[PDB]
# Entry
Amino acid sequence: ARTADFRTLERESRFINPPKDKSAFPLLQEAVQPHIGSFNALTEGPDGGLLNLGVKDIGEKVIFDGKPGYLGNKLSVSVEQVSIAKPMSNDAVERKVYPSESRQRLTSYRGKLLLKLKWSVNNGEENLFEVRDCGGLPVMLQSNRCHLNKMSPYELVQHKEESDEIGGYFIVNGIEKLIRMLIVQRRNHPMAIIRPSFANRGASYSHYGIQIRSVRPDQTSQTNVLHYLNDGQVTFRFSWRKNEYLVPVVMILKALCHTSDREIFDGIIGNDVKDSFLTDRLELLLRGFKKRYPHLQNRTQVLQYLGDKFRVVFQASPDQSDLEVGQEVLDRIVLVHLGKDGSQDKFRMLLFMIRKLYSLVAGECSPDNPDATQHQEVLLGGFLYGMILKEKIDEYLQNIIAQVRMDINRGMAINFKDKRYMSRVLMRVNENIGSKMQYFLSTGNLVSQSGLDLQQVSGYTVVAEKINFYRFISHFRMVHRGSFFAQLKTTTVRKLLPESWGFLCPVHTPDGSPCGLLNHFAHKCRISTQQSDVSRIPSILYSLGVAPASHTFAAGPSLCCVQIDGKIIGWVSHEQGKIIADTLRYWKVEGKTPGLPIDLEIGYVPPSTRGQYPGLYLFGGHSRMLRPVRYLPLDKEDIVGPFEQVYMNIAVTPQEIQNNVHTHVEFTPTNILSILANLTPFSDFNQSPRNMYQCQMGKQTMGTPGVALCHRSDNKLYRLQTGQTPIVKANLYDDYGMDNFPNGFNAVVAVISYTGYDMDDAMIINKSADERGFGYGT
Amino acid sequence: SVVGSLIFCLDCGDLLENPNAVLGSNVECSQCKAIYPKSQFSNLKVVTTTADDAFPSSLRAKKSVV
Amino acid sequence: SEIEIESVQDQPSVAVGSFFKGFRAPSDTTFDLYKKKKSEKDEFVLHGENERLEYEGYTDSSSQASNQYVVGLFNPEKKSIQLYKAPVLVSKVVSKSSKNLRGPKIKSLRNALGEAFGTKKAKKAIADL
Amino acid sequence: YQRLRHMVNDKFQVRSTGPVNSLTMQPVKGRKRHGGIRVGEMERDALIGHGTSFLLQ
Amino acid sequence: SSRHGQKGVCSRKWPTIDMPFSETGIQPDIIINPHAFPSRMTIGMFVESLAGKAGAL
Amino acid sequence: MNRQPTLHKASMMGHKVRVLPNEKTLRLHYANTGAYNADFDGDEMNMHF
Amino acid sequence: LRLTAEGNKWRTDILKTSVDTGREAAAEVTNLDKDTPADDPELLKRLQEILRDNNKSGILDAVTSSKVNAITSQVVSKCVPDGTMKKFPCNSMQAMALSGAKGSNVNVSQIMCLLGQQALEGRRVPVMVSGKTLPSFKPYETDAMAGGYVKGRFYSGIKPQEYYFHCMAGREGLIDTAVKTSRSGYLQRCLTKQLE
Amino acid sequence: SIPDGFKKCKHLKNFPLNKQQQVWLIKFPSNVDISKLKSLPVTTMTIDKHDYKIMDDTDIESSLTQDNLSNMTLLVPSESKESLKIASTAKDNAPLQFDKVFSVSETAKIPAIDYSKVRVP
Amino acid sequence: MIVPVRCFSCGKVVGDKWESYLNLLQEDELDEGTALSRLGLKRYCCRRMILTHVDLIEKFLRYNPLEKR
Amino acid sequence: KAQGVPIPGVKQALEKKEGLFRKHMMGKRVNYAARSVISPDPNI
Amino acid sequence: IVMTASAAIKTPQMTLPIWNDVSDEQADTFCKSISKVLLSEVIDKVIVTETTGARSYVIHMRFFDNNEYSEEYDVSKEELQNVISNQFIHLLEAAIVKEIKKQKRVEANNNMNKVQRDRQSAIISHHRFITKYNFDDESGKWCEFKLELAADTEKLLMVNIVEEICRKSIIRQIPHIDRCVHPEPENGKRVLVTEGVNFQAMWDQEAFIDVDGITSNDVAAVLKTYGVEAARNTIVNEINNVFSRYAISVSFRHLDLIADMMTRQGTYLAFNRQGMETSTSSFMKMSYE
DNA sequence: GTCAAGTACTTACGCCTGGTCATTACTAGTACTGCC
RNA sequence: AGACCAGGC
Ligand SMILES: Nc1nc2c(ncn2[C@@H]2O[C@H](COP(=O)(O)CP(=O)(O)OP(=O)(O)O)[C@@H](O)[C@H]2O)c(=O)[nH]1
Ligand SMILES: [Mg+2]
Ligand SMILES: [Zn+2]
Ligand SMILES: [Zn+2]
# Structure
């Protein structure tokens, strides 16, 4: 019985005829599902993909006449549907262009981008829906807009691509570009943050604060930061364009809903009325608002005050009333992940965020580490490609108003209802959005007038090398923290932290300057790329023991808060709260429950002494980090996340299970290492700086890039002539199809001082081995 | 309707004025325009202990050890 | 131990409101109970009135899809209780003085400096020179 | 084993003369542009520490 | 390189009649220095040498 | 001969030359490598004439 | 780099002394009595208080490291060279370590006896917010293995939770190699310009 | 100001308010058949051959250490059976606060870890 | 890519044993130990050629520029 | 010293590393010099 | 040492040679007099009681037992009363008046002895708005003083205020010295290491400390009081024991010139753009930065 | 006159090799074409 | 000549 085996009779047969059905080695395709499945999600899915939802968030933007006290006619122009076509070439009837033809032309493999406008006039008299092509949009390979989507490895050979060719990359000017992943703060979760830079906001700012990063349903982000002032009050903070703004939160609390002034008291303070720290710091807040703003005594008067201030910077029209532009402040800034028709749920989360900040300054909590991967989230590169596509058709929808701004100002021959007038102004605007995307992929620079919620501005695309298959598969698993963090003389951001167990590889990290910052995944870490279900989960938390958030009067660490994807569902005690963290785990693995998905992350934070803020936090949204683990009652696959993992006891091997303390075990202790880290042989015998060098050098080898080298046209390429499969190999070597791409040669290596020409790091070769083709390459 | 150093209205929950910054025998709500007497608001009493970590010392460390 | 049940009121008879601590009212303030016949996901509306305030409330239709609150009246001499199927209503106190207070529709550059950054103020002090 | 891509043939840059820069008349940065290697500040002072002064010039 | 971080340039393509040879008749085709091991502690390369040769036999 | 980083002054010395016929690499003796701080895992080093 | 059957018996019976070192070192720092159980609620209360402070957790990780490094010196001075299967000068590993050809005694200690304590920035392995050092270990356990003291030589191999602790100390040597030379290279740059 | 379908209830039912009698606010999930029940513990019980966990939630709507902290004011019918009023029986013009709050809730037994089938040697 | 003539370490002609090896694994069902031994591969420097040859030219030859497909 | 991506003035062609003193006076590109990978050699 | 010439050194120390005649018990009790004692280090807890309705504070403060802090810190009951009277209330008034200006944008009886009425009468006389004072004259356990405000003032914290004044009020501080520690004798000699530099204040303790053997750490504080050549000798010995920890041998001919270049003008000049402004060569200054 | 609180300003290892990218709007003009 | 990216020691 073989302990392992090459399969010579199987791999030679798979070289002769590729499978006419689905591909062998399906584990290779699961390493690019975060790249493929994110670009699929911006085109298809519920609600028309994540690009139709991003159109709906931009909305209608108007500009009036000067023809006579009405302003004229409205021109409520909009986009309502964006759609991408597969790439077709025009030589009459259109042919299907395959990316083999696009590599040889040294052009960009790109498909047609079709926006349809809504040229409304006078709030709905007549509309002029005209589909307008906006240049060629660069489509990435093996997506639902590429022609390699549902092809067999037989048909991928007949279209010259490669048999087990994984997509995941854009072809831009004949160069296989690739958008990197970025690690960033989790969505929908306000983490208490201590930073000395919070004190430079002005006068009497402390270093205590809280910070939520909400995301809209189109995967666009927005932060909402609360600062603690030493004066006794607190201060909201946001940014709309690239500049900051500072609002006192009682103005925002009185704007979100109709509030009694004890509702602000009752939301923060629970039954701990006799807490003298919490009462007196709240005395300063409400009296300090009545002192500064003696007016503004109901909802509709606070809301008109806040709308008048931010009117000139939200580009509000002369049509918009102060009250209805005040909601446009609240709909697009404060805690946007609840959206419209969530004003109560935005309100409860604010009262939660004040109390967590008041419990932070009391010392009864700990600052959440923003660099620890417990509180981290992934920008997939596909969702960044949809965030940038929103703000280039937001700007395009504004460029067709700045053109009828000058036309009002300079010219006079204007009729908004004329079909030829629309067809004259749209010949004056830069419709070529696809060149503005091809400029992004070719350069990496992020040109946006409203700079997105992430810090860096450059380096978003990296040339996928195809210099080695170890190099090529490594681009699709690498995670970069940011270019802000590279040019920084600190050390504690680069450390290997134990929250990265089974998510980030401890080994696969480049030596030198990017050490600790660019690091790859464990190979079973998969990223959620679509919205998991939420809808049945409060229906099966209220029957489990949760009293709802509308009939509660509870806050503080003495209770625990129940939050599904960032909204309070209700309130329950700590002792009952740990039962319905364990009951939902038993019901999500036993898949008979029709509402708990397996892909749910149930993070329970138990009450402690001056630790993390306690509460049950359920997460099910996009862009999370997930890994499989085996759950010991009813042995089945359980899927957990990084925020979840730091309070449960998974055992590394089924012999080190201890009685009544362990809940899960790993499937294997080899799914903590990366792709490249599992392939070094007997890795547990090396010194750890020497395992980190093979992950770096082994993807710099002269090997075989592919077998379509007749049909490639890349500017530099390294091919080793006669490669071999190793005797000594992990079982993941034969599982990712690495026999399709040899990288070296089984060399008879004599560990001997014999020569004197190989002492310090050097080595020598037999001459008549190299006369016989040993290690030859072109 | 008296919690801590502050008072509220019994009818809409509005934070009432400071009863010593307002003239005699009457305190009016700024939203209900209902008026409470200065009696029944006799004295505002609040005790507040320091946070039991504010004074780190060698002698504090011997409290839990002994 | 055990608690005995006499009957279960299957009809809308009473209800529960939750305002805040110290909510009182004059004794003539009476309330209204509204109902549309759906299936057993009932959605009610509370309405009330005195001279200077309005008392209006509503059910939580997002959370009453799975909850069923019941008020009981227990005799401690016996072990018997009745059961009254009573909803619990999110309610709020609407004023009348500051209810319809409102500014103008549109109050016809430096205006965004009440909510501005600490060096945004210092740069426009240079813009006056 | 493995053969890495760091062959000698992408090295062994040598210059006797060649193209010079325009505004400094110094040799050009580059192997492919047939230019010179730099004797920077950290090599200059270690060429003072020998006490040799015609090697510096 | 090996698969254990044992990088190093080629230094002389050493001729076959000047190499060590076995009683088996073979001659190696890479000589590596043993001194690259103790400061580096890459014993995964030593156990690969047993596991490689026991596999080819 | 010279090798970066030229930390101390004995990282930049003066050698004689023996011209070798075969390949395109510099040939350094082992006694010099303690003072240049040089290993043979792909170090390149300057040659000023 | 093998040891005798007598040598591994010496090795595996001194490493049995380390099974209670992490608790005796914990009970010394927290000033609870000796021979307290590892699941004592008074011990688990004060260990959670030690974790929340940076300075109080510096002396917990210094007393425990002072004892498990005393276990390490007992293993190496017994098993080397007295418990080696092939000895000097035939032991080619130890011949180039004694003579200073390449290596050290601390290298052949990790090859043949014990890899030892994995030191972070003066400390042991960093701890999570919960009190676990890794998901494999229970929260706040007084085991010496749970704080980075690994008992696996490179000849036999390191456990997967010992492997992950050895990757923390391995990266830290590469971080100080890369980024911290920008602080020392500007020392010589300022020192030379005045003294040229 | 009445929205669609919201019919006002004309007539209402009894509410007999007079160691004396106590007012309990008891929670039930929607899948509980209340229309025939007899027992209730102080613990767990059986409803349709299924166990349900029952607790005491006095310390959320009020607190266990301080009098007069109630928020859920009970609404009672008037002396007309036509409209609703605040509960009042003490001649103090204060609402009648709840005494005992019972929260019927679902529960399910997690099986213990079979240490003999998962600890493979 | 294709089978190496004249193995690297000693110099024995090896390149003709490849298609016989695939015969001695498929038709005559023998394991890899016997099938290398019957082909006269006694030294393990010879035995690591035919055992671990990838023979990747069969994946190359399915990209033929000189025939319609 | 000029309010306004910006165009480098005549001061900034002198100041730092990538200036004129450090980049082109204190250290220069040189003629008559080579650089190649080293291989060890006894019998030297 | 070299690059910044930091007179604001990160951790100043001072080595004090104990005499060969005085006892080891006479040392670790002597260091209790030098090592400072904050008012923070003697208070168990402070219980304020704000009254309003004429806002009026009741600043009750609870110490430890007199058998507990006078054993640890050697602080008498009488000296603890003066720090409250003459150091703490004066600094408490310096913060309450500072806020009111800028916000405009169990126990026994009373007549035990009339000296308590007289000592209360001085506090009402000398201070600004303190209307009561009492101190535990038999056990030192508690102090309690009233503090009055007007109704014009909005609400002060007066616990965060009271804490930070207790952290700044000193019982027995020798200036620029925080803690005096007696370590084990390293290489023979008896050594007393302080966490602060003040040579003038340590010249008073002749009988305890050898005053002609006091080496130190701060190369600029010894420049100020022991002339130039002691700072030149301190800079070599403070740069020698940074290569002595790492077992790096560098001779005293290089450490001599780096010393003598940094003290070539009598002051203590760094190696940076400030320390080279006094130089003849202008291109050397135009080459550095 | 003296002492502050806050600003403004400068630094941040050496050498070496590859690749890619690079101004945009618009505005007035000459020419193309549909038209009567 | 820059901007970024990927490296080598
Ligand atoms: N001044 C700098 N020198 C460097 C830099 N990177 C590498 N080096 C030099 O290159 C050498 C790299 O050594 P390594 O990082 O590989 C440590 P290692 O244990 O692998 O050395 P060996 O034991 O000789 O293999 C070292 O001597 C350094 O002086 C750098 O960024 N700056
Ligand atoms: Mg090297
Ligand atoms: Zn009111
Ligand atoms: Zn052979």
Q: What stands out?
A: The first strand of chain D starts at residue 3 and ends at 4. Chains D and C do not touch (no CB pair under 8 Å). The two ends of chain D are 47 Å apart (CA to CA). The longest helix of chain D spans residues 41-44.
